[PDB]
C-alpha cells in the first residue's frame, strides 16, 4: 500500500515471496485440499527452500556492494550452497556452484554456459530469486539488465534468463501500485515482444521446437484465459504449465496474480487478496514452492505489508531477517 516503491511494498514483496516458498513447499511436486491446510497457520516451523536461500544471497550481494557485482554474487551463491546444500536445489545448478567454489574459476559466467551440453539451463531458478533486483533498481532498463545478469550466473539459456526478466518486470510493475489487470499484462507483453525479437532468443526457441517468441505467446494466452468462462485448474496447467522450467512457471505465477486481483467465490472471502493469490497458486500443483514464491513476490509488492498475515508470516523460517533485508534495500537503494 501507499506510494510507489514504498517501504510497505518492499516489505510485502519479500514477505509474500517467503510465504509462497514456505507454505508452497508443503505440496512440492504434487483447492479444498489447500484451504484445509492453511487452517494450520491460524513459530518458524516452515523451512524455506532454495528459492529463499538464493534470494537472500542475491539481496545480500546487492547490499554489500550497493550495486550488481557478478563475482561477489556468484561467490555468495556458491558459499550459500556450501553452507546449506540441502535446501532443495536443482540437480543441474549444483554443478555451477561447485565450479564457482574453485578459486581458479575467474570468469563466473562460464560454468552456467557449459550446462546442458553448452545450451544453459532453462529452469526457473533464475526467476525464483529475482525479486530483489526490482527492489534495488527503479528503472525498467536497469531491471532488465540486472535481472538478466543475475540470472546468467546460473541460467545461460535465453529461456531461463528471459523468464527471470519477465518475473522481475512483474515485480517492478507491482511496486508501482494500482493497475488494471489488462494494463499490467499489456506492459509485460510489450517488453517480452521486444526481448524475444533478439536473434539469440529466436534461435533457442526454434531449436527446442517452441513457438516463436515463447514468453510473448504465453502472455497472449494469459489474456485469453483471463477472458474465458469457467477456467479450470487443468486448463491453466495445460496452457501455461506448472513445472520447473521457467517458461512453465513464470507466466503461471503472473496469471495467478492477475486472476486473483478480483475476488473468487470459490475462495472464502475471509482471505485477503495476498492470501487468495497464494492459495490459488498452490492449488495448481506442480512446482508449488516456486510458483507460489513468484506469485507472492508480485502480490506482496502490489498489496503491501498490510496484507501479510502475522500468523502466516511468523510460521516462516527467517521471516525477521527477510523483513530486515527488505528494509535495508529500501534504505540503500530507494534512498527511502
Ligand atoms: N537445457 C536443458 N535441457 C534439459 N533439461 C534441463 C535444461 N535446463 C534445465 N533442465 C532441467 O531442469 C532441472 C533444474 O534446472 P537447474 O538449472 O538444475 O536448477 P533450477 O534452479 O532452475 O531448478 C528448477 C527448479 O527445480 C527445483 O524445483 C528447484 O527448486 C527449482 O525450482 C535440471 O535438473 C534439468 O532436469
Ligand atoms: Ca524450492
Ligand atoms: Ca521449486
Residue numbers in the entry: 14 to 43, 48 to 59, 70 to 363
What do the authors say?
ADP-ribosyl-acceptor hydrolase 3 (ARH3) cleaves PAR and mono(ADP-ribosyl)ation at serine following DNA damage. While coordination of two magnesium ions (MgA and MgB) significantly enhances its catalytic efficiency, calcium binding suppresses its function.
To test this model and dissect the structural basis for the inhibitory effect of Ca2+, we determined the structure of full-length ARH3 in complex with ADPR and Ca2+ at a resolution of 1.75 Å. Two metal ions (CaA and CaB) and ADPR are positioned in a way similar to those found in the Mg2+-bound form. In the ARH3–ADPR–Ca2+ complex, the orientation of 1″-OH group of the terminal ribose, corresponding to the 1″-O-linkage in uncleaved substrates, is tilted toward CaB. As a result, the 1″-OH group is directly coordinated to CaB, whereas 2″-OH bridges the dimetallic center by interacting with both Ca2+ ions. Notably, the metal-bridging water (μ-aqua) is missing in the Ca2+-bound form. Taken together, our findings suggest that the distorted di-Ca2+ metal center and the tilted conformation of 1″-OH, a position for the scissile O-linkage in substrates, are likely to interfere with a precise alignment of substrates for nucleophilic attack, resulting in suppression of enzymatic activities of ARH3.
